[PDB]
Amino acid sequence: MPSYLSPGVYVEEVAGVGTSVAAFVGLAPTGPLNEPTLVTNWTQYVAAFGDFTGGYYLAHSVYGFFNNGGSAAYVVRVGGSAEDQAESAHPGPAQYLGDSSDRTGFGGLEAIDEISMVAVPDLMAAYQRGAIDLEAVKAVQLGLIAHCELMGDRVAIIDPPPNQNARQIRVWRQETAGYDSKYAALYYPWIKSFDPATGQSRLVPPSGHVAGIWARNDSERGVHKAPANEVVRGAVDLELQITRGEQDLLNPIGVNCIRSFPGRGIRVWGARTLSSDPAWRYLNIRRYFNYLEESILIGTQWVVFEPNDHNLWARIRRNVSAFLVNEWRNGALFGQSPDQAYYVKCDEETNPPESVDLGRVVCEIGIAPVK
Amino acid sequence: MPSYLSPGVYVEEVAGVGTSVAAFVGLAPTGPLNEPTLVTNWTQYVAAFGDFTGGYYLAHSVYGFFNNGGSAAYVVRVGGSAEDQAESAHPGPAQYLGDSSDRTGFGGLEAIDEISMVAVPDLMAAYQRGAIDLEAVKAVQLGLIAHCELMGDRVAIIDPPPNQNARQIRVWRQETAGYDSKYAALYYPWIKSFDPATGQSRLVPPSGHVAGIWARNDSERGVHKAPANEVVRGAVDLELQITRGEQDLLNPIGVNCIRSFPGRGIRVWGARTLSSDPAWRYLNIRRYFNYLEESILIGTQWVVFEPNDHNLWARIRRNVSAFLVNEWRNGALFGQSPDQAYYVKCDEETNPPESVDLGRVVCEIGIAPVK
Amino acid sequence: MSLPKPEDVLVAPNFGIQIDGVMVEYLNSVSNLQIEQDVIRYQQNQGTTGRNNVTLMPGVAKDGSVQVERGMSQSSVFTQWINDSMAGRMATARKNATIIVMDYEDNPVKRWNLRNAWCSKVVAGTLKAGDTNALTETITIVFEELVVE
Amino acid sequence: MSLPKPEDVLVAPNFGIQIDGVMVEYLNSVSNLQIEQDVIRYQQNQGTTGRNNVTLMPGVAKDGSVQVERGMSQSSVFTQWINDSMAGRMATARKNATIIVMDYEDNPVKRWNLRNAWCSKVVAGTLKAGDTNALTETITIVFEELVVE
């Protein structure tokens, strides 16, 4: 049962852009100071960061929101290009908070709201150069996932290791670095693309445009729909075609694939959560819930509860139902009537007589699961 | 009872050039590596092979079909040449996988789509130079057939030994190399042709040219009738002129014949498959069904989208009916009305209430066979 | 529909389409026509009248169905459909017009429109200051080669 | 336009034009038409019916849009436009018909009228003593060779 009560439960310590905004961690050719994470469009991004001259992955993964569906995204700089240490698992693509300094890293995003996804394009940029041991990587991916779990309303984009066969991913997934969490997902094959600064080819991780798809998907239909069949616009080719005999081994363990389809182009096909929990296996379901939570929590935003009183309960019940009945009227929910499609409860049994400080307990039923 | 609900019916493993496409596996000198399997025309073939000078059968089989009907073929380099063990069955022209490198031999199958026919021009030739006799060749033919059987839509064309009596082919096929399946065809005689690189004559298999027989038939008239009267345009002569007793000998054992007629030329005459199953005795029927399958599968993009929605059943019936009735109104079906010629059904009873991902069940009658 | 007495009502006409015609106002001009033929002859060499043969049966007619979208919005769904055809691509598609029962889960009548259906017109409403009850409707005209229940 | 439910309303139709058509009453007769074609054939030497090919696609139609100026005033803006064409100069111009949202700063739909557009008519209203609700409107008729969203 995800919080159905509050932004924080034990202490009331607390006293838009849409789902398309995401954040990326990596190095810039130039860039602004690295701490003030900024959110913007390609047009301004390049003016501050640089025209791919540093050889960094942010220079390319940024297009995920510009050569595909998008608007703006947050960028953590970490540091810039050397003229004409950051490759360690500690700084940069790390939980590099700086002891409550919001320094470049997962920690620097803790103070920032309105982020639905977080990617780290330069973690593997120096995989070979910086001798980034699977640990240095595993530790970072764990830090990213933990960040997302703690914020509670955004997810992690996890990169596969740089170059390995299907057997070897079955291996890290089951034997050396499985993550098992409702807050993360991974795609396997690497994508061939070009780099106009110097020539026809570069290899990039299945991120960037892959995330651009989520923004596209949300505009086409409800977040409840999965981008289980969508074009990776901007892709040139794939390193490997993964056949049915391989899909049979990878989909059951949560590895999503991108394939070149005979007459449809390069498309995203897999749509599973990198999680062991049957409830959260499907990505579109995990997303539907984050979607509803962001909108309902912003909507019913009252600060400092006055008197625990039925009159507030009545205002709340009425507002939640008014919000949800449209999901039913529209095609998002299942059921012949609101009666079955959703459930709202807020009365003295969720808000018992002790009435200690915060009340406002609202119980809700989605389709089968309960909040 | 072939598949129709899915390319994969137990696991949801499921998430142009033209139809006159064939693949040829064989050896060549100064040719692109086996990894970059190419789709080529003759000009391109020569750039990737030379002007028949290596003395390999790929040049004849590719030049053979190319000068008949057809638009493209996949060229499998496999391995090289000696000046003026690549020939061995295992290290190249056989059941190669490479831990899914899919670079050599039959390893390119499954990995590569949009191929209806496959053949191996040169393996039936290394039987002498490298003493590749007995099981060494049979093993390759078994592989080619097995891959077709596993894919579900591919037909293998194979050769009999180059010099034998009609009684000998009967024994060879019945006692030493019988196959009994829906995925292959064999023609008895060998063909007299030539090789301009060295001279005016050369012994070649009933391969390559035959690919171009179905390609012309299917592209100019359709797959409604077998190309059982077509002219082998590039033949000079036949090694043996088959007589009536010989035609009677081969007919009941499933061996097809090529014969010379008095003012009609050299034509392909037999039209049967290498199978004991009465249902699949004719090539025309086997090809008809594969054609329909390619069109039906490419036509459905609804792979991962509300696996419980029933409105999808209605959308399925709509698309299937429109396609098959259009065929009824032409020469595809033996009947007076779609009511007595074509059937489709998709309902709750075909898609059980549990609503398993193995949905998409559509019951169909092709002309009479059930699919 | 517990009794023979009710009839389908204008509860929820809706459409199967790949083009996102998500919300509509109405559907009109839907019909099924078999063309007849008429011949008059004089009778078989005797004192009786001629005959009229009207049992002759020529082929089936084709037409188009009017579709009205409630009004203009920022989503140019129909405009692009017409642009693709004007550009020269045979951008046709199959459609399904559905008639729904009082209890909407019951959806008994559907009409299949041939895959060759396409849009020939987009028509704007009148824009006049103060009209108030004039609300920028759009009319889409689609040709339907063949309609089957 | 916070919801999918609203539609554009007759809030503020207005026009980009070099000729000072500063204040207007209304705009009408605006449409987009692709001409179809119809051929009937007998089928391929067998016992099946003929076919109707309606997927044929001829070119795009052209027309004119009615423009109504609230009424006569001392500023002869439209009169000179027609005089220039009557005089023989190819005095054509590009125009833009704009559709505006409830919150007027939002201006989502625009239609471009080809540079070859010109005025063929100026029509006066009826002048009758005592009519009162008759207020000397003027009708301007403009030919639009090509209209693009």
mmCIF file of C-alpha atoms in Angstrom, chain D residues 37-138:
data_model
loop_
_atom_site.group_PDB
_atom_site.id
_atom_site.type_symbol
_atom_site.label_atom_id
_atom_site.label_comp_id
_atom_site.label_asym_id
_atom_site.label_seq_id
_atom_site.Cartn_x
_atom_site.Cartn_y
_atom_site.Cartn_z
ATOM 1 C CA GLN D 37 -12.927 9.524 -59.629
ATOM 2 C CA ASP D 38 -15.064 6.461 -60.349
ATOM 3 C CA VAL D 39 -14.406 3.516 -62.680
ATOM 4 C CA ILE D 40 -16.286 0.245 -63.087
ATOM 5 C CA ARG D 41 -14.702 -2.918 -64.520
ATOM 6 C CA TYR D 42 -15.620 -6.549 -65.167
ATOM 7 C CA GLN D 43 -13.506 -9.161 -63.337
ATOM 8 C CA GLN D 44 -10.587 -11.322 -64.435
ATOM 9 C CA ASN D 45 -12.123 -14.006 -66.732
ATOM 10 C CA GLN D 46 -14.076 -15.788 -64.021
ATOM 11 C CA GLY D 47 -17.422 -16.119 -62.265
ATOM 12 C CA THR D 48 -17.074 -13.111 -59.920
ATOM 13 C CA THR D 49 -18.491 -9.602 -60.016
ATOM 14 C CA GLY D 50 -16.939 -6.546 -61.326
ATOM 15 C CA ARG D 51 -15.129 -4.028 -59.215
ATOM 16 C CA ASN D 52 -15.424 -0.369 -58.391
ATOM 17 C CA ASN D 53 -12.277 1.624 -58.185
ATOM 18 C CA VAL D 54 -12.801 4.760 -56.136
ATOM 19 C CA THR D 55 -9.215 5.025 -54.862
ATOM 20 C CA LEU D 56 -8.357 7.065 -57.881
ATOM 21 C CA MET D 57 -7.172 10.539 -56.903
ATOM 22 C CA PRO D 58 -7.587 13.605 -59.272
ATOM 23 C CA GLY D 59 -6.399 17.067 -58.267
ATOM 24 C CA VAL D 60 -7.463 19.624 -55.685
ATOM 25 C CA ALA D 61 -10.326 22.082 -56.093
ATOM 26 C CA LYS D 62 -10.179 25.871 -55.664
ATOM 27 C CA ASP D 63 -12.850 28.371 -54.575
ATOM 28 C CA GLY D 64 -13.600 31.707 -52.903
ATOM 29 C CA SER D 65 -14.534 32.823 -49.391
ATOM 30 C CA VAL D 66 -17.287 35.304 -48.522
ATOM 31 C CA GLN D 67 -16.186 38.216 -46.352
ATOM 32 C CA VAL D 68 -18.550 40.585 -44.647
ATOM 33 C CA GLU D 69 -17.554 44.000 -43.530
ATOM 34 C CA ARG D 70 -19.929 45.335 -40.966
ATOM 35 C CA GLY D 71 -20.930 48.185 -43.175
ATOM 36 C CA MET D 72 -20.162 51.158 -45.250
ATOM 37 C CA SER D 73 -18.006 53.936 -43.881
ATOM 38 C CA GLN D 74 -16.032 56.757 -45.430
ATOM 39 C CA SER D 75 -12.892 54.607 -45.857
ATOM 40 C CA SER D 76 -12.906 53.043 -49.335
ATOM 41 C CA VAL D 77 -10.538 50.177 -48.663
ATOM 42 C CA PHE D 78 -12.301 47.407 -50.588
ATOM 43 C CA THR D 79 -13.449 49.704 -53.356
ATOM 44 C CA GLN D 80 -9.939 50.505 -54.352
ATOM 45 C CA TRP D 81 -8.883 46.875 -54.216
ATOM 46 C CA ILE D 82 -11.516 46.034 -56.803
ATOM 47 C CA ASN D 83 -10.627 49.123 -58.854
ATOM 48 C CA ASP D 84 -7.008 47.999 -59.186
ATOM 49 C CA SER D 85 -8.030 44.652 -60.601
ATOM 50 C CA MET D 86 -10.622 46.188 -62.952
ATOM 51 C CA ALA D 87 -7.891 48.496 -64.225
ATOM 52 C CA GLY D 88 -5.792 45.475 -65.297
ATOM 53 C CA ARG D 89 -3.078 45.184 -62.637
ATOM 54 C CA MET D 90 -2.555 41.729 -61.164
ATOM 55 C CA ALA D 91 -3.183 43.222 -57.716
ATOM 56 C CA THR D 92 -3.344 40.039 -55.735
ATOM 57 C CA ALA D 93 -2.319 39.354 -52.157
ATOM 58 C CA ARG D 94 -1.686 36.686 -49.490
ATOM 59 C CA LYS D 95 -4.190 36.330 -46.623
ATOM 60 C CA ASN D 96 -4.457 34.615 -43.255
ATOM 61 C CA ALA D 97 -7.726 33.574 -41.618
ATOM 62 C CA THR D 98 -7.199 33.091 -37.868
ATOM 63 C CA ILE D 99 -9.258 31.133 -35.313
ATOM 64 C CA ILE D 100 -8.850 32.191 -31.693
ATOM 65 C CA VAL D 101 -9.417 30.560 -28.280
ATOM 66 C CA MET D 102 -11.566 31.659 -25.337
ATOM 67 C CA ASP D 103 -8.408 33.086 -23.808
ATOM 68 C CA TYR D 104 -7.542 35.086 -26.844
ATOM 69 C CA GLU D 105 -3.810 35.042 -26.477
ATOM 70 C CA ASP D 106 -4.021 31.415 -27.638
ATOM 71 C CA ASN D 107 -4.329 31.431 -31.487
ATOM 72 C CA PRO D 108 -4.094 27.720 -32.604
ATOM 73 C CA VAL D 109 -5.554 27.594 -36.099
ATOM 74 C CA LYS D 110 -4.559 29.499 -39.167
ATOM 75 C CA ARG D 111 -5.398 29.118 -42.830
ATOM 76 C CA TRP D 112 -3.160 30.428 -45.533
ATOM 77 C CA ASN D 113 -4.707 31.775 -48.655
ATOM 78 C CA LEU D 114 -2.556 31.834 -51.751
ATOM 79 C CA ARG D 115 -0.852 35.038 -52.922
ATOM 80 C CA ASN D 116 -2.924 35.018 -56.018
ATOM 81 C CA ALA D 117 -6.111 35.792 -54.103
ATOM 82 C CA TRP D 118 -8.158 38.752 -55.397
ATOM 83 C CA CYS D 119 -11.572 40.522 -55.095
ATOM 84 C CA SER D 120 -14.217 40.001 -57.788
ATOM 85 C CA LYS D 121 -17.273 41.505 -56.112
ATOM 86 C CA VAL D 122 -18.487 44.291 -53.966
ATOM 87 C CA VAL D 123 -22.188 44.047 -53.056
ATOM 88 C CA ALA D 124 -24.324 46.665 -51.314
ATOM 89 C CA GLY D 125 -27.163 45.942 -48.911
ATOM 90 C CA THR D 126 -30.778 47.156 -49.366
ATOM 91 C CA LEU D 127 -31.637 50.737 -48.532
ATOM 92 C CA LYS D 128 -35.256 51.097 -47.363
ATOM 93 C CA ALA D 129 -36.860 53.797 -45.266
ATOM 94 C CA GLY D 130 -37.671 52.678 -41.748
ATOM 95 C CA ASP D 131 -36.079 49.216 -41.911
ATOM 96 C CA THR D 132 -34.104 49.874 -38.734
ATOM 97 C CA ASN D 133 -32.431 46.454 -38.478
ATOM 98 C CA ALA D 134 -30.965 46.832 -41.926
ATOM 99 C CA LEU D 135 -27.603 48.496 -41.441
ATOM 100 C CA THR D 136 -25.827 48.923 -44.829
ATOM 101 C CA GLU D 137 -23.592 45.806 -44.755
ATOM 102 C CA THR D 138 -21.094 45.159 -47.531
#
